[PDB]
Ligand SMILES: Nc1ncnc2c(CN3C[C@H](CSc4ccc(Cl)cc4)[C@@H](O)C3)c[nH]c12
């Protein structure tokens with residue numbers, strides 16, 4: 001059995017995706033998740049939805065409790081986490097509305113706990129050094145890429161996400177520098193969400209949707225809250241269809257080996273006294 | 274009516290610039306500002322001076338309460354904030370003693386709140402994502418650039434400031450890397466001062482004065498506290514004259530549109546529940 | 547008289563290096579050091595050993611009390627600090643098992659106090675801006691380099707260490723970017739250990755041992771805890787021999803000038819009210 005946690009991002013966190021919905025507030029050792037978990041199904045597949053920023057978008061990226069969110073989904077029995085994330089495009093060919101199935105990140109966050117193993121929690125004892133060479137589940141990403149193609153969606157098969165602390169958007173000097181580093185898209189939430197998922201032995205994949213060109217390009221609409229909201233109003237249906245079509249595919253394929261390998265990588269990264 | 278807050282930096286924070294001086298200690302929801310506000314005038318113009326590091330230079334860059342400083346100046350009724358900042362030069366042609374009217378930044382700070390909207394304050398409710406494509410007021414910068422020319426001062430019409438956490442100065446590897454990124458000057462205070470000013474709807478501009486060549490160049494005096502202090506002893510009069518000459522120019526030009534546009538950009542960056 | 551603090555890193559923190567061992571737990575104004583200081587001698591030389599991560603490796607890099615560690619060694623009367631550090635290699639020619647006598651760093655840490663002078667401690671009053679152009683003692687490094695040659699060890703005479711926050715290892719995008727920056731090796735502990743040593747007026751040098759190629763190369767064993775542990779099991783004897791041979795050399799050379807210059811650089815970096 002698979003069970004899929006879905007973490008909804010900005011404008012991309014609609015509960016109406018699940019049938020047979022039940023709201024469940026939970027607690028974890030790291031505190032409360034962003035909001036109630038929503039338990040439901042897509043076709044025959046058990047899913048668990050969680051709004052990254054709360055259902056009213058009340059929590060800014062720096063204050064999102066990534067530890068509690070991931071812990072809650074794990075405790076619920078999730079084998080996979082597929083998230084949505086809005087993002088700025090750092091590449092001419094990645095147009096607003098395009099989906100990017102990201103495969104790498106560059107961390108520019110500064111204020112966030114990136115591990116469960118902080119020496120303060122009984123549930124996560126020891127020192128943990130998780131490998132990050134392959135941060136995203138390649139098997140899940142494959143299915144997302146193939147599905148987006150079946151849907152006729154404009155979609156990119158890879159991309160490096162730079163995650164900034166926020167909540168401010170980047171300056172132009174920063175935007176230009178991220179391009180020189182080889183970042184393709186920019187957001188405020190991928191790190192440490194992807195890190196904690198890996199420590200939890202969970203298959204994690206991200207659906208990034210471009211909403212703007214940040215501030216590097218010429219003759220584009222400037223990034224702003226209104227601009228991001230506008231692009232998502234117009235294009236959010238794409239991410240919904242992709243999830244709805246991808247999820248039944250995940251449920252019909254075999255994961256025992258992939259998950260065994262993840263659980264091992266996670267277990268062997270922890271040193272006990 | 275305009276009112277100009279002036280935040281004095283290292284060696285560049287002299288109260289004697291204002292006539293008709295009155296000392297006023299204030300409180301804000303984010304805590305106490307660095308020091309007493311000093312209320313005064315330059316020609317007919319209402320100004321408010323604040324020493325970034327305290328009048329005895331007792332507060333290091335990491336511990337400066339940028340939120341309280343900006344909030345205090347806003348509450349006082351400031352329409353503009355013009356600051357001074359000492360800095361290292363990352364460019365051969367920017368010589369110690371030169372003024373740089375910076376137009377961009379690269380953030381390398383790690384420990385600083387960069388927003389009023391942290392979900393803990395009643396006075397600043399919601400989630401705020403301020404755009405940072407144009408961090409400094411171009412109209413104020415124009416007047417500074419034209420004025421420095423009228424004064425015959427060595428001055429650069431643009432520049433990218435990298436702001437490091439400090440309080441240590443950079444290593445040589447870091448100094449060299451900042452050059453590859455396209456940083457022109459280096460300090461410890463521009464971020465998040467410039468960010469918070471933007472969230473407050475205030476026209477912010479910075480007078481940067483080069484005091485050293487950091488540690489990248491050859492055959493220059495090494496950066497140290499003594500070296501920075503020495504260059505400022507010799508050149509601080511320039512920043513004083515530039516302020517004294519610029520400020521009456523700001524007071525005689527029309528700002529209603531510029532300020533309306535800033536207030537809008539600020540208001541539309543905030544999402545309420 | 548010299549006295550040498552030795553901070554042992556991962557797999558490189560063996561007390562058996564000292565003769566005449568006495569265990570001494572201490573307190574400092576910044577809290578407790580990682581573990582008991584171990585007082586002892588190498589030939590005629592007074593040494594003080596401290597396990598960076600605790601003797602059971604229980605403390606992850608982010609939580610190591612670098613302030614307490616350096617303060618404790620200073621209070622004990624150490625003139626020099628020579629440390630060991632495991633690291634990933636960012637350079638083809640730096641092979642697992644090679645020693646790198648690092649001479650520069652690039653800071654990518656985010657959560658660590660980098661100064662004793664935080665305005666909260668009576669023992670360290672004022673604002674301190676330590677110069678970091680030459681972070682490591684060149685005289686100590688010379689002796690390490692010459693000694694490693696006498697031992698026939700594969701050793702590199704310089705290198706730039708990028709220190710990441712951890713505890714996760716880097717992504718591939720990050721690993722590749724650190725190469726473009728000119729980093730040669732990667733770890734999680736050099737900063738701010740090297741910074742605090744400089745503020746304390748102590749000669750600091752680092753013995754870095756490559757344990758892996760991080761994740762940038764092709765056809766190498768992936769970095770993981772097991773992989774790092776394996777390389778250290780095989781090569782730790784090298785770092786031990788190098789320390790044991792270097793230390794008597796330090797004790798027989800003259801340091802009064804070097805140490806006077808360090809003490810001055812440290813004293814003149816502090817501004818009092
Ligand atoms: N240029 C850019 N830079 C960094 N991040 C983003 C993002 C990603 N997030 C969107 C969001 C800011 S826009 C927005 C819109 C509607 C509402 Cl209800 C709430 C917020 C932040 O979490 C970052 C999109 N474009 C970006």
Ligand SMILES: Nc1ncnc2c(CN3C[C@H](CSc4ccc(Cl)cc4)[C@@H](O)C3)c[nH]c12
Nearest residue numbers: 283330359360361459460487496498501502
């Ligand atoms: N190479 C460089 N790197 C980073 N920042 C600076 C700065 C800017 N600030 C000066 C100041 C250090 S020097 C100084 C001198 C007198 C007194 Cl009373 C107090 C401090 C820090 O706030 C950074 C100048 N050169 C710099």
Ligand SMILES: Nc1ncnc2c(CN3C[C@H](CSc4ccc(Cl)cc4)[C@@H](O)C3)c[nH]c12
Nearest residue numbers: 556603632633634732733760769771774775
């Ligand atoms: N590729 C790499 N990246 C960053 N740091 C390292 C380091 C340096 N440290 C090793 C250590 C992780 S591996 C390990 C092995 C045995 C035990 Cl008991 C405990 C931990 C961290 O402190 C970073 C080696 N390779 C690295």
